[PDB]
Amino acid sequence: DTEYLLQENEPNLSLDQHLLEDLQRKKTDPRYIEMQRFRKKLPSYGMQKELVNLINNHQVTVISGETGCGKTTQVTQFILDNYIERGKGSACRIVCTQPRRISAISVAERVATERAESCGNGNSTGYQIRLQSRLPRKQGSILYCTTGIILQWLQSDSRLSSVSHIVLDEIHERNLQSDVLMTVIKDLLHFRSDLKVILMSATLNAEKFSEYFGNCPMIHIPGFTFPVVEYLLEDIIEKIRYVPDQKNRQEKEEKEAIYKERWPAYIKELRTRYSASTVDVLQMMDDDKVDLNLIAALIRYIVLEEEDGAILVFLPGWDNISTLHDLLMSQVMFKSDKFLIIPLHSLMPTVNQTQVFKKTPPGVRKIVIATNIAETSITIDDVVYVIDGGKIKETHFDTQNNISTMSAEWVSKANAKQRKGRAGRVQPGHCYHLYNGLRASLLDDYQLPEILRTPLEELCLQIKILRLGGIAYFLSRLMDPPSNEAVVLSIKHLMELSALDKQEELTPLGVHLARLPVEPHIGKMILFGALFCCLDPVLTIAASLSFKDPFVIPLGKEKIADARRKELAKETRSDHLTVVNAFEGWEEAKRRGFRYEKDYCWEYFLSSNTLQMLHNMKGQFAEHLLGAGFVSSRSPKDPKANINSDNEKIIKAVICAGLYPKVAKIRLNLGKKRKMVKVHTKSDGLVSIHPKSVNVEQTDFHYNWLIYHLKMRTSSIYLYDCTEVSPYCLLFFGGDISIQKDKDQEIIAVDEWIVFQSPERIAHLVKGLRKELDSLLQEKIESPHPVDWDDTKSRDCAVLSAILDLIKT
């Protein structure tokens, strides 16, 4: 994925002349001319001279423009075309980062079109994302990529030598990776004077970026929109006469308190300007959930009562998107071939985000159901109607309880304004917001930056792999530095994962974990899934921890669902293996045909949509492992990586590799039916098992130890998903080993509180094996290749076989 980077930037006079002549021919080309007239309508085009002069005269510049300004497709072109016009065309190598893969591809393909060229193929414009590229010509070129690709590039060339201009787009989004890239770039530019840096924001709050970069020049590009009418939840209900089918810590609590206090009076005044039935329906509305039936009813109204145009729907996540898609397709209206209904979500297959293609006649109407990714520059043609569900998925991090969650939260005003602007690019539009007027007045101006709300482990490994020095020091230099407590927790988890040594340097395991673009506990799990040849069930479990588990509890069926779930557990005493068995049973049912598949899901109360998403994530995980050289195939099911996939002990040991140090000691029950099942933890004292767990009532445990992933605190701490494991799993994959005796007995302690009976020689064996495993992983840093398990005698097989023999007890 580094091929463009490794190219050397070498200006050429002959190429300068040739490109200047290429421009002359383009000026006469009907195709090019037609495209130029489209461009001239964009506000960016009109100030092109001042943008290029600012960039040419200053090393760092900040560009702000709102929706429709055209910065993302235009500014790269302005630089290249200015160089070409000046007879310096070959001196340009322009790289522009995008927040998502689909944006990189879509923008690059659109710019190629506007230049009357195909994308890649040695032409002026192309893209690079992980494992897929259309690369432009070496000199006088534009490359769209992701932030991830730049971070990868910095491992190979930390100077970004051959780049003349780096354009960081959509910076207002404040993604973790953008913030770090920004600090890295700031350090580089001070050292190398020939790099131009251009920072682009879609919102007008960009002064902070200018200050960060030393109060560098700023410039504004006007947005472009036709007028868009906005509707609140009151207006929508009133307009369509909606008939229902039925009937993130302290500063959120503050805002809800204010909402609650202003609620009665808001409602009271609302009865002044709206029908009584509207207010009563609005009053019944659930704030926690987007109402998908309302969205269906609104789409129905638009189609029947309003003018032609495409409809864009914004929903928090995959669950909502697939649910609304099924809901629409279950109505004979939308079954027609005059509707095209397209899901858009970032974790579906690559150009399975299919929404770019020229839509076929407008006798057929496009309905795009998308996440917040449709807010960015993406080609969706002819949108007259935007339905804003009002929510966005956000990660939050409770550092006092060490709990990280993903939830749907209210959009900011900036989000809402971007969604509004999507309806006004073609003709006068309509944007329907599913929040009420009181909610609107209480939205935040902007979202809190990710760096403040997110676990830092993945970022910390990036810092180390890029040799940026001390972790806490670097993080303190970011534009918004994270809290000390988030930093201390992050560094601690990485040491307990054995990713960092006590001196905060990468271990060989850590090097490999840094090469996997997932959280390190997931990375460690899938890595040992690869090394131990468990791949398929381990990837299932990993996907399940990353998104969520497939089970649902329908009303009235609670007791029945719990029994079916425990049935799926069999004797494993594992929530994680329960998901494996569910998943395998589902796949087997799928082969027999869709009746059997739906049947299986109703029998075990499984979400088909969740299962499908888990399956897609598995493929991704395998791709990451293939690129890191730990598997030879992109198939989770590849026979050679699955020889151990039926072995319960081996899979359990891999789950333990991933989830340590989240470890609990069982408090023995002693046939007391009046006492809840509880467990001891290092950090939290005695806690409870969640009722959803297959172990919640278990009296029969074969070992004394659990590992868990999800912890929640309501009136007290509950463990959501846990797996019984043998002490040998903790012994190999856990913390420091110590030996103690007490007379007769040989004792081993792991991280000092995990204490069990075991011969002293086992402790020495394990210390030996850990070091041999380090050396194995060390050798693969420079020469990554999958372990060949068909060659015994190989000494990699010897070491890994010995580890497997140990954790089989």
Ligand SMILES: [Cl-]
């Ligand atoms: Cl059933």
